[PDB]
Amino acid sequence: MQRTAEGELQAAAKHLANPDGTRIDFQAETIAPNDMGSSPLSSGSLILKGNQFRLSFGSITAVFDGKKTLSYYDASENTLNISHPTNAELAMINPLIILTRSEAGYRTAMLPPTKGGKVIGLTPKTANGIKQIELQVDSRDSRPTGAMITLEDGTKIVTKITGISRTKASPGLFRLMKKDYPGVEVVDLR
């Protein structure tokens, strides 16, 4: 007998439940329609604590407070940006958010498996810019191994997990203050 997709999703979430925090190392690539304007495969990290996360990827350091506010520093533009992201925008930068909070918006189904892995498919009940989310997990213990988000326009955001570890994440990792970026331009997008 084998678990439902919902069952596998809730077994995968257990791997991110360390109370003091979880560190995820990954590689990610965005493949744009017709491969025009794609972003190359590169490396990143996510620190999770409760509903908060700190994302390091590309030129960006981003923090989500677990409520409604995303703050991110872009080292290439020298801007500190504060915004109210949509639920879809959060999944696009942190696909594992589908595991850390209750989500009312997606139908769940099992997709064809891989060698030693399972594949869970999530499709929105209401249009939201996302066509499908695909979470890859290890067949032994449902440990997340990767994710792919396909946008309605065909963009593929592909994430490969290269490590999951324990960490003691302090309050300070989930805040960005203007003093920490000499000369930074603050842009309030709220």
Author numbering: 0, 27 to 215
Question: What did the authors write?
Answer:
In Gram-negative bacteria, N-terminal lipidation is a signal for protein trafficking from the inner membrane (IM) to the outer membrane (OM). The IM complex LolCDE extracts lipoproteins from the membrane and moves them to the chaperone LolA. The LolA-lipoprotein complex crosses the periplasm after which the lipoprotein is anchored to the OM. In γ-proteobacteria anchoring is assisted by the receptor LolB, while a corresponding protein has not been identified in other phyla.
The structure of LolA-PG was solved using single anomalous dispersion (SAD) on selenomethionine (SeMet) labelled protein whereas the structure of LolA-VC was determined with molecular replacement using a model obtained from Alphafold22. LolA from both P. gingivalis and V. cholerae consist of a large curved β-sheet comprising twelve β-strands. In LolA-PG the cleft is continuous and relatively open (36 Å3) as compared to the scattered cleft in Lol-VC which is occluded and only expose 0.15 Å3. The equivalent loop in LolA-PG is well ordered, probably due to stabilizing crystal contacts. The Arg-Pro motif is not present in LolA-PG or in LolA-BU. Instead, they both have a glycine located at the corresponding position (Gly75 in LolA-PG). The equivalent space of the arginine side chain is instead filled with the hydrophobic Leu41 in LolA-PG (Phe43 in LolA-BU). This is an interesting difference considering that a recipient LolB protein has not been identified in bacteroidota, hence the function of these LolA proteins must rely on other patterns of interaction. It should be added that when the sequence analysis was extended to include LolA also from other classes of proteobacteria it is established that the Arg-Pro motif is also found in β-proteobacteria (Neisseria meningitidis) but not ε-proteobacteria (Helicobacter pylori), hence the motif is not universal even among proteobacteria. Furthermore, there is a difference in the theoretical isoelectric point for the two proteins in this study, 4.8 for LolA-VC and 9.3 for LolA-PG calculated on the mature proteins. We investigated this hypothesis experimentally by ITC and could conclude that LolA from both V. cholerae and P. gingivalis bind polymyxin B. LolA-PG shows higher affinity for polymyxin with a Kd of 14 µM compared with 56 µM for LolA-VC.
